[PDB]
Amino acid sequence: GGGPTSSEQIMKTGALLLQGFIQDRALDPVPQDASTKKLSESLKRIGDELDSNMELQRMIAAVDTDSPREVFFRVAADMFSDGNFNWGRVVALFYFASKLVLKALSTKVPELIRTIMGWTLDFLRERLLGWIQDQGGWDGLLSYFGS
Amino acid sequence: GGGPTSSEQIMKTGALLLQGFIQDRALDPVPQDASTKKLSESLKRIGDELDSNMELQRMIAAVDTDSPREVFFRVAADMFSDGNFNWGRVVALFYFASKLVLKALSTKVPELIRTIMGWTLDFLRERLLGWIQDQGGWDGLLSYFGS
Amino acid sequence: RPEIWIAQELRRIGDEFNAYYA
Amino acid sequence: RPEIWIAQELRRIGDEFNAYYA
């Protein structure tokens, strides 16, 4: 039953705004009531602007990828270390969180490829290798394709 | 010093072919010698064909996403359960492995968004909430944007 | 189960490839 | 460290936004 000032609403609306933002920077749109949608549209504009900030994009790409969590809290803490607060900073932090999702994944695709390659090559070694040797290895497939 | 029939070369070349394939279905191209590149080009054609197999795409999307590893080995085992082997089956298995990478990630993006949202909202609750309450919650940001 | 459908479709596809490439 | 550069750039951006929106 809390209003906008309530911690409940601040956390609920903050989650909807952030999720919508992260999906903007990208599947289906987060359902939002009319007022919240109006905020989201403004955040979309700020995100659009910051996406064209080429220096910022270069630096986000340049960040060490091993622990995105450490990166997030170091940036967040650093941003607000002078004890000052304003809405511009809050929105810029949300923007950074959205870019971190894209960045983090950029680590994920390589790791997923390596993991899935592991399964496939494991199956191949233990189940297919004998038959492939009977073909004289992959040079057999060269033949197969008429090469 | 093994030739194409050697398990060493079969595993090495198999890894290069599979990695190239997975990257085809998608960053930079796997470096391949001339003969291996020739195979890769044939695999690209088969992948291209199977990508237009709409039924197959529907089913891959329909698969339960929780354990991609179980899915891989069940499919692989099922494919070869009649004890028969041929190059067409080997290539189709490689194709499936490539699609599993894309599928797996499709689970990853949601999980990454939720994880990164967790950090952001944690920071917000513990560091920003007081100031945001002073604004009367997110309705303050509505004002800020002139809404 | 979609998994079994897929295994069946890949086997069919593989064996069809083999008919054309051999 | 790129992290510190980014924190500095986001703070700058935020405070610039605030100057224009307030």
Numbering used by the authors:
A (entry chain A), B (entry chain A): 10 to 35, 47 to 167
C (entry chain C), D (entry chain C): 143 to 164
Sentences from the paper on this structure:
The intrinsic pathway to apoptosis is regulated by interactions between members of three factions of the Bcl-2 protein family: the BH3-only proteins such as Bim and Bid, which initiate the process, the essential effectors Bax and Bak, and the prosurvival members, which oppose the action of both other factions. Core/latch dimers of Bax and Bak form on treatment of the monomeric proteins with certain BH3 peptides and CHAPS, and Bax and Bak core domains form symmetric homodimers, supporting that unlatching the core domain is a necessary step to Bax and Bak oligomerisation and permeabilisation of the MOM. Bim and Bid are both potent direct activators of Bax, but Bim is less dependent on interactions via its ‘h0' residues than is Bid.
Here we describe the crystal structures of BimBH3 26- and 20-mer peptides bound to BaxΔC26. We therefore made a complex instead with a BaxΔC26 construct, this crystallised in different conditions to those used for the BidBH3:BaxΔC21 complex. The C terminus of BaxΔC26 (G166) is visible together with one residue from the vector (serine), whereas the C-terminal residues 168–171 of BaxΔC21 in the BidBH3 complex are disordered. The BimBH3 peptide is helical until residue Y163, as previously observed in complexes of BimBH3 with prosurvival molecules. The C-terminal residues of the Bim peptide (–R–R– Figure 1a) are disordered. The first of the ‘h0' residues of BimBH3, P144, makes similar hydrophobic contacts with Bax as its counterpart I82 in BidBH3. The alkyl moiety of BimBH3 residue E145 occupies the same space as the BidBH3 residue I83, but its carboxylate moiety does not form a typical pair of hydrogen bonds with the guanidinium of Bax R94. In the BimBH3 complex structure, Bim R153 forms a planar stack, with the interactions network formed by Bim D157, Bax R109 and Bax D102. Bim R153 is also hydrogen bonded with Bax S101 and the backbone carbonyl groups of Bax D97 and M98. A small shift in the position of Bax helix α3 between the two structures may be because of the contacts between Bim W147 and Bax M79.
